[PDB]
Design a protein around this ligand. Structure first.
Ligand code: GTP
Ligand code: MG
Length: 167
């Protein structure tokens, strides 16, 4: 069975590692800010090699090179962090416009839906400008609201990625 590299990117503290811990242990374990790459190999009947990249500012510049070979991209966002939503939109578009990954399906994980003031799926599409097809081309995209600490929507997020790789 073929291995498919999945890249997990997003700003620091978005909940990337929290999501990957749930995908494996089904539990909320303590996390440390990822300053490197934490690679987990999961099987959901296709095995994928998920690369949880670090989201700290001075590490984001490495995403372009570290994602080499990814078949799908998961961009995790902190839905409750309205003060850093312009910063996440800027990073999401840097990935979308990266000429190295133009055909890769993009799953946008709207994490932290439990927090008060969390943005809705509609609100995220509007702020991120994803309602403009011109700069999106023939790329398949999907938004999945999650609470990574409880795993709410996390199995449904990985099912979309798996469905995309099956194609
Ligand atoms: N309330 C709430 N907290 C969450 C959620 N997901 C993650 N967190 C918390 O958010 C913080 C950051 O989570 P991490 O998984 O370490 O974030 P990260 O994306 O890996 O960050 P970097 O490693 O620095 O890129 C932790 O305190 C988590 O427990 C969620 O859905 N709801
Ligand atoms: Mg991390």
């Amino acid at each position: 069975k073929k291995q498919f590299k999945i890249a997990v990117v997003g700003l620091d503290s978005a909940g990337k590692t929290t999501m990957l811990n749930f995908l494996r242990f089904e539990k909320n374990i303590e996390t440390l800010p990822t300053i490197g790459v934490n690679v987990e190999v999961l099987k959901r009947n296709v095995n994928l090699s998920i690369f949880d990249l670090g989201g700290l500012l001075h590490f984001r510049n490495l995403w372009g090179t570290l994602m080499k070979g990814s078949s799908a991209i998961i961009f995790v966002m902190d839905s409750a962090d309205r003060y850093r939503i312009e910063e996440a939109k800027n990073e999401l578009w840097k990935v979308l416009l990266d000429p190295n990954y133009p055909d890769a399906p993009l799953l946008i994980v709207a994490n932290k839906q439990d927090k008060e003031g969390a943005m809705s799926i509609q609100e995220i599409i509007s702020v991120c400008g994803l309602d403009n097809p011109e700069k999106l081309g023939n790329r398949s995209w999907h938004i999945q609201p999650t609470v990574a600490t409880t795993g709410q929507g996390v199995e449904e997020a990985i099912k979309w990625i798996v469905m995309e790789l099956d194609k």
